[PDB]
């Protein structure tokens, strides 16, 4: 066994006891096991949690842990859900963390909410397409998530279908994961300058990353919204104009800078035969008007997408249609 014996009892820093289960998949998310509260019974497939574990010196886990401790406390999320009158919030809940010894070496572990399949698998099973309803419903919930993490001094910088996981018991609830390279843009309310972060480089995923990230500057709120824009196009059409040139970041940036200058040209490239949904253009055009340090007007962005739902004879009923 690499880290935890199936059935082992671990106690976190607040003295809460958990039992370890089987590893969850083999994905490039690190070492993850199913977990539950300590009891006589074994941890089965009905496990509500997971234990993510990495060595103490691992920088990304610590950064990820700090974000979870700061912005993902269960009560902190519920207070936001009640005040903003949301059905749920797609920020995974943090249940505790601790240190674990294995063969004289120290490891830090974190207990989190458990999820089922990622969006990418569902997307690939649907022949690399998502309906206008699915895309607009996903996007409204990601705007809820982004407003929350932005209001908590963080930017994600890597929004994509493989970082969007679905609730293990509820298929209409999507969660944004992976904060290993999340960035604290305005610590103690002081916005970061328009320059690189000296400690780490937040490149993201080449196809979806923002122009700011391509320019080698620290990610900001506008960049998270821009990444979401490229996701929406990729989900509706299965393509992006720069998809055959990923090994060249100069090309990807060049293409993005040109397309930001003329959004009608992007709509023309991505949508065949002048069939482009108006709310995508109105959204790209609103994000375009944002300054590096500017607070986005989220409700206005959600209203642009709500107009898109009315155009297809629908309402925000929270149905993902997966
Ligand atoms: N498409 S899939 O079927 O291969 C698949 C992918 C992924 C997972 N599960 C990953 C996680 C899970 O269940 N809980 C958390 C909490 C935090 C977190 N942070 C990065 S990954 C992650 C996870 C299950 C199935
Ligand atoms: Cl295709």
Author numbering: 20 to 341
Please give the exact wording used by the authors of the publication that reports this structure.
For VRK13-364, 29 compounds displayed changes in melting temperatures, ΔTm, larger than 2.0 °C (an arbitrary cut off for a positive hit in this experiment), with the top hit, GW297361X, displaying a ΔTm of 9.7 °C. The VRK13-364/GW92761X structure has a less ordered N-terminal domain and in two of the crystal polypeptide chains (C and D) models start after the protein P-loop region (residues 68 or 80). Nevertheless, the most complete polypeptide chain in this model contains an intact P-loop (chain A, residues 22–341; used for the structural comparisons below). The crystal structures of VRK13-364/GW297361X (chain A) and VRK214-335/BI-D1870 reveal that the glycine-rich P-loop region of these kinases can adopt the so-called folded conformation. In the VRK13-364/GW297361X structure, the folded conformation of the P-loop is stabilized by a sulfur-π interaction between Phe48 and the sulfur atom in the thiazole moiety of GW297361X. Other than this interaction, VRK13-364 P-loop residues do not contact atoms in the compound. Ligand GW297361X can stabilize the protein N-lobe via a sulfur-π interaction with P-loop residue Phe48. In this position, the side chain of Phe48 approaches those of Asp197 in the DYG motif and Asn182 at the ATP-binding site entrance to create a hydrophobic tunnel over the compound. Another important interaction facilitated by GW297361X involves the sulfonamide group and residues located just outside the hinge region.
